[model samples]
Target: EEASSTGRNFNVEKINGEWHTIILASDKREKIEDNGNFRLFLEQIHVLEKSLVLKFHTVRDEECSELSMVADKTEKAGEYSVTYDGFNTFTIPKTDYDNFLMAHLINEKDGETFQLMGLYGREPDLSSDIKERFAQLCEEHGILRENIIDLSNANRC
Candidate 1:
């Protein structure tokens, strides 16, 4: 298992032959609450042929609240159906996922950063600008080292 900047313990594991990431939030329930300012930025949603991998740039105040909203909206819009494998990990299909994410990303203000929840791997298809910016953001949010997990194999944890 690994720890994130928000002090949540998360780890990636393969279940039913698919990779799934899980974040454990029981340790710091107080810091994560809904005071209206808590937010989660949809960083990247990788759409593979079969599935969509969603990565959210979260903040210290974020928990399951914002994610639930996103999930509800996405499902209600018939974009995709999300199923929670665990408390913090959810899976969805690639159908209409990119379209939904682009709508949200284009409206984001400049120079703003959010706390990422767990460790993630960078996709080679991402542009250089995004890679550099993501690294910078990770550093700014104090998750540079811990947010990058070694997912080379399932024995990583």
Candidate 2:
């Protein structure tokens, strides 16, 4: 499935083994690509028995953007977003289909919201590694518990 809001577009899909997504560009292609090197982005992985959640973020000057997943779903890359501001969320119910939503994190310094994108289930052996890497990234980027909040649950953590 897919959705669009304003100048942004979000696509979701369940590929053979990965939850491939595309986040649309918010600015000119050249401008966005030129600034990619300095962008301090992050992907946080949260594990649960039923599924995995991945939150995306970028620390850009005064604003920071982020997104997360609560379950599994799918759509075209172009159908969604293909920009630097990508974020999404999803959850796969053991029994049937359930709509997933993004968990947002807003930058305290500038008051900008981030998107939370869903994650694909990699091989079991590799899953643990990915989760660990996410933790390391949280540390590297200083995404403190103080700076993050689960908008869906309204919980600070």
Candidate 2: worst-modelled 10 consecutive residues by lDDT:
92-101
Candidate 2: residue 4 lDDT (0-100): 28
Candidate 1 residue pairs in clash (backbone atoms < 3 Å):
58-115
Sequence-dependent TM-score of model 1: 0.25
Which tens-of-lDDT digit does each residue in 12-85 have in candidate 1?
11211222222211112222232313223333444444344554434433334233322322432223333332
lDDT of 2 by residue, 1-157 (tens): 4332111332222321222111112112222232442122223345443344556554345465666545333252122222233333222211011122222222111334442322222321223353344334333444442332212111112
Quality of model 2 by C-alpha lDDT:
0.29
Residue 93 of model 1 has an lDDT of: 14
Each model's lDDT:
0.28, 0.29
TM-score per candidate, chains pooled = 0.25, 0.23
Q: Candidate 1 — which residues are off by over 4 angstroms?
A: 1-70, 74-85, 89-124, 149-157
